[PDB]
Amino acid sequence: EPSPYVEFDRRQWRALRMSTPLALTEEELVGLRGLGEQIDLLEVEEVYLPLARLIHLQVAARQRLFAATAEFLGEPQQNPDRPVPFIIGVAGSVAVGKSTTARVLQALLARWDHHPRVDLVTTDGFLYPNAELQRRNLMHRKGFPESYNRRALMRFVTSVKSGSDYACAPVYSHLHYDIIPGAEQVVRHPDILILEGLNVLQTGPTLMVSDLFDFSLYVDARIEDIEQWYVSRFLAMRTTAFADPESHFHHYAAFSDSQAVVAAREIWRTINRPNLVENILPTRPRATLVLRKDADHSINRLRLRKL
Amino acid sequence: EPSPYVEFDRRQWRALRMSTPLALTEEELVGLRGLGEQIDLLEVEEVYLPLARLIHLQVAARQRLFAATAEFLGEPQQNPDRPVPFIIGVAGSVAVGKSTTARVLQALLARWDHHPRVDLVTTDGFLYPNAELQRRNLMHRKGFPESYNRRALMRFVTSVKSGSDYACAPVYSHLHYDIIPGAEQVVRHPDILILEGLNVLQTGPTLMVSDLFDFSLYVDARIEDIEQWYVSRFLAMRTTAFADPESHFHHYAAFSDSQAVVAAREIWRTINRPNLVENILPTRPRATLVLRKDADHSINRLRLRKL
Ligand SMILES: Nc1ncnc2c1ncn2[C@@H]1O[C@H](COP(=O)(O)OP(=O)(O)O)[C@@H](O)[C@H]1O
Ligand SMILES: Nc1ncnc2c1ncn2[C@@H]1O[C@H](COP(=O)(O)OP(=O)(O)O)[C@@H](O)[C@H]1O
């Protein structure tokens, strides 16, 4: 039976790397991975390099596509130095490694000879402020579709892909657990934009951001494995993030392995798991490429969307 | 504020026709329109011709796109005489003229110099048989998402776009109001496939048909105007379709204008309107091109998706 997909194991996937060059040191790579992520240069070669290639083969191809509409409408032509921004989306559960994958990807893509302006934006900054969240009674739904100002989010990406000179996005603080007053991230007509978020790939009664993606990634892994990464990281943060007195979570630093595990699991059980099951996972089918990571965080399976 | 859309009035739209040739007589056009549709050669020139152009500009462009993935995967190349089928979807309410628009489009596209194999398939044949509908208690939800064997529908389109030599689809009888036993529509690797249906443009927790469209159309019009076309056509069918003794609706032929109007409205109120409002209209935002028709069935506004 025919399928819209094609799957590989790392062995099959790596052979598609070809000549793509590795332009990242093992040290640069470090400042790119988040706590708990195992990414090393090898994985960047057998997995991220082919991927970088695929994306580059499509950037050109995807443009012939907008050219047509421009030609059809009988408009000016190029401005080879201001084409239509290539939008890439990275989706996946909390603690699955999206940020690592997105930062690495941005590092690889920016380090290509064109030296493209590759901007990265997370939907974090599009959550509603805690005050506003409390108003709607959503302080325990942070991450669910309704906890984001999607109108703003959509306005943003649309602006960037429609060729605006610059666009602004609010900024979220993981330290204070809230939106930073007056903080803004300005994006100036990038060549490529990477939007990272749990709910980037979702669809709805209104034109959404997933409808503006030219390529998409879904970082996947077993649910019990992700809970594990989540709990584990929670305990680990007792001495890194939580250790800071300014942290909205400083009280967890004192917890014992045992209590921390109990706490980490309750949050996972009442917030992140339900959201992953009800909102995130149902979007996985639409991702151009799904990266299957096993229990050790290693990506060794991939599902590509050819149709 | 930037938008993913661009709108035109017929005046602006017609100028994009250019040189596109009219290869249809006023007589050929006739056997293409359904009862009540006002389409004439003029509209085919000021509206359908530009559209035919746009589509042709994209067929080429859309292919450079699959080429890339083929090149990336390091596969054989062309077979210029078996490229990836261009899938087009035509959505819209019951009685809005989809079938006319789809048949005309197919006529125009087939009559292009390449003389492409342009097949047209309606989702009608993918409804569940009345017996099966009765089992699920859906005899009054015919047209709603759940009244279709979408797995089959998806299997079909996927097969055709994945390059199969041929694919089969069941056949629906408007006369007997049910699926025709043993009837099948065989589609052989067309160059272009047009899928016509109320719910073609919808999205869901699973990869769907709308996800395989390379271009899409949404025939629109005011809701009170469509009800009008529906009721009006119901009465008109008393002497055409319903007049046949074999019709599952032959009993309506006898109705008086007044009773028929009462009946037509109850069906519209309890079936077609709810479905249009709850399922069809919410998909309009995702259509590549929306054709706004006014009360006289004339299309004089269009909304194009550039993003
Ligand atoms: N409470 C926290 N305090 C500080 N940093 C955090 C906190 N929670 C998560 N982070 C970091 O911010 C990012 C959050 O990632 P998550 O939201 O867990 O998605 P993912 O792990 O897939 O990137 C990661 O870099 C994570 O290490
Ligand atoms: N009860 C019926 N009997 C015979 N033909 C019908 C009947 N209802 C609709 N048709 C015809 O079949 C097609 C049904 O179209 P509809 O399902 O009303 O969508 P649309 O009008 O947008 O094409 C049209 O050609 C219509 O004229």
From Swiss-Prot, chains A, B:
Its main location: cytoplasm. Pfam families: PRK. Signal peptide: none annotated. Gene3D superfamilies: P-loop containing nucleotide triphosphate hydrolases (3.40.50.300). The keyword Transferase applies. GO terms for cellular component: cytoplasm. ATP binds at G92, S93, V94, A95, V96, G97, K98, S99. It comes from the Bacteria. Belongs to the prokaryotic pantothenate kinase family. This is Pantothenate kinase.
